[PDB]
């Protein structure tokens, strides 16, 4: 698990402190415990220093555990660094062999190559929609782009470092992404002591997006006689 420590985490297999992925395990006692102990499986007992995330270490050279040198194969203060697991079937649970699979993930940077078993919809344009291209979700209006993406490029971004164009995975054409429109709504009135009449301004909104209707520059104004 990420952020853990102990002779497996420290010397054998380290997960990064922000691991994205799943850890999966099952007892393997029938496959991996042998009648006299299964010495096919061993673990690193000693290191000079703890290994980095996803470092692997095949080293078999003798470890030194004191101030004095050990210029040779054996001693009192120096050791062979790998020790076997005594996996006997008479071992209690917790002392039995577990097979482990760590599925470790990388999200979008390039377009994805591994995805879940979903199916694509048809593509619609000039309408406000939700979308999901290769796991890149959003909501917006899709338009055929005139942006000159180079052949390797998948997505396009504005000055704000926000997506404003995309490549469809199925047909390699480029779509401009525009946010579905929003604005302040303000109510205009002569005040209740004069009348319950009101007019309404959709601020910065075009009247096609929304009984008198009037396109001011302040927004679409509704319920006022020009």
């Amino acid at each position: 698990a990420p952020g853990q420590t102990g002779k497996i985490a420290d010397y054998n297999y380290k997960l990064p402190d922000d691991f994205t992925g799943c850890v999966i395990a099952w007892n393997s006692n029938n496959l991996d415990s042998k009648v006299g102990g299964n010495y096919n499986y061993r673990y690193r007992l000693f290191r000079k220093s703890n290994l980095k995330p996803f470092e692997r270490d095949i080293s078999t050279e003798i470890y030194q555990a004191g101030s004095k040198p050990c210029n040779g194969v054996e001693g009192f203060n120096c050791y062979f660094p790998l020790q076997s697991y005594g996996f006997q079937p008479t071992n209690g649970v917790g002392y039995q062999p577990y097979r482990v699979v760590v599925l470790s993930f990388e999200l979008l940077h390039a377009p994805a190559t591994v995805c879940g078993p979903k199916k694509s919809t048809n593509l619609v344009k000039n309408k406000c929609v939700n979308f999901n291209f290769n796991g890149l979700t959003g909501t917006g209006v899709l338009t055929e782009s005139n942006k000159k993406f180079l052949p390797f490029q998948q997505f396009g971004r504005d000055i704000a470092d926000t997506t404003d164009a995309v490549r469809d995975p199925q047909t390699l054409e480029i779509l401009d992404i525009t946010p579905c429109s929003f604005g302040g709504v303000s109510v205009i009135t002569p005040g209740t002591n004069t009348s319950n009449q009101v007019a309404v301004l959709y601020q910065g909104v075009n009247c096609t997006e929304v009984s008198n209707v009037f396109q001011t520059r302040a927004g679409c104004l509704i319920g006022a006689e020009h």
Epitope: S33, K34, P89
Partner: antibody
Framework: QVQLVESGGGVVQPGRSLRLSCAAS????????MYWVRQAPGKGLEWVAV????????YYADSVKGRFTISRDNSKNTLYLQMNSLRTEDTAVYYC?????????????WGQGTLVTVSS | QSALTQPASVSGSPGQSITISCTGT?????????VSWYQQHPGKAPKLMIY???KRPSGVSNRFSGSKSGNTASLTISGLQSEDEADYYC??????????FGGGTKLTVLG
């Protein structure tokens, strides 16, 4: 198909020695524990011995401990029982057997059985 | 090798469901989910029917099933047939790492 096939059983004198042999095929013999089990005429099964996959570890029933010796050839795929100081109560059908991925400690596959007759 | 206790025999009519009860100790049956059951037909070698208290090997009939409570372990055979007419041996590992068989039960089907 897995086979265990056995030889060396016969009539023998008390106090004598005899060697049983069990050839193995259709599985990776050297990956599994190998067993001897016996059955006196008209009686139940008695466990006799086991040997580890590599032969480094051996275990015996108290009825044969300090007398018998199990051994294996992982190049030939052959299991042996050396029987020494045979007693009339060693008179039985002897079966070799073996583990599998169901469990190394199971007697999953069995030989045809070979009869040993310790008689004066 | 202090044997597991078993009934000397059991019997039933075809199509009945019947049970064979093994018994051991905290060193063996009570110590491990390792109880194994061997069928043996007359004049031939044993075959494994149930292992790890209740698992079946491939090709064994789903008529055979197994259980454990405390120091006691059980085989059940549901819907008896003439092919069930055999000796059944319970077996266990032990914390001594010795294997122990039971006394053997003959199933006499009333055919």
């Amino acid at each position: 198909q897995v086979q265990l096939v056995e030889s060396g059983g016969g009539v023998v004198q008390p106090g004598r020695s005899l060697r049983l042999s069990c050839a193995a095929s259709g599985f990776t013999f050297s990956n599994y524990a190998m067993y001897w089990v016996r059955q006196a005429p008209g009686k139940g099964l008695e466990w006799v011995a086991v040997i580890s996959y590599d032969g480094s570890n051996k275990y015996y029933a108290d009825s044969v401990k300090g007398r018998f010796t199990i051994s294996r050839d992982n190049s030939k795929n052959t299991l042996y029982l050396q029987m020494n100081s045979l007693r009339t109560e060693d008179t039985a059908v002897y079966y070799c057997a073996s583990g599998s991925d169901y469990g190394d400690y199971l007697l999953v596959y069995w030989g045809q059985g070979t009869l040993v007759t310790v008689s004066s | 090798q202090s044997a597991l206790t078993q009934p000397a025999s059991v019997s039933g009519s075809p199509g009945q469901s019947i049970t064979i009860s093994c018994t051991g100790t905290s060193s063996d049956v009570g110590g491990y989910n390792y109880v194994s059951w061997y069928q043996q037909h007359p004049g031939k070698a044993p075959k494994l029917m149930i292992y790890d208290v209740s698992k079946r090997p491939s090709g064994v009939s789903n008529r055979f099933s197994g259980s454990k409570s405390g120091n006691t372990a059980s085989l059940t055979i549901s819907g008896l047939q003439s092919e069930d007419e055999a000796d059944y041996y319970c077996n266990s590992l032990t914390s001594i790492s010795t294997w122990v068989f039971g006394g053997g039960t003959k199933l006499t089907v009333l055919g």
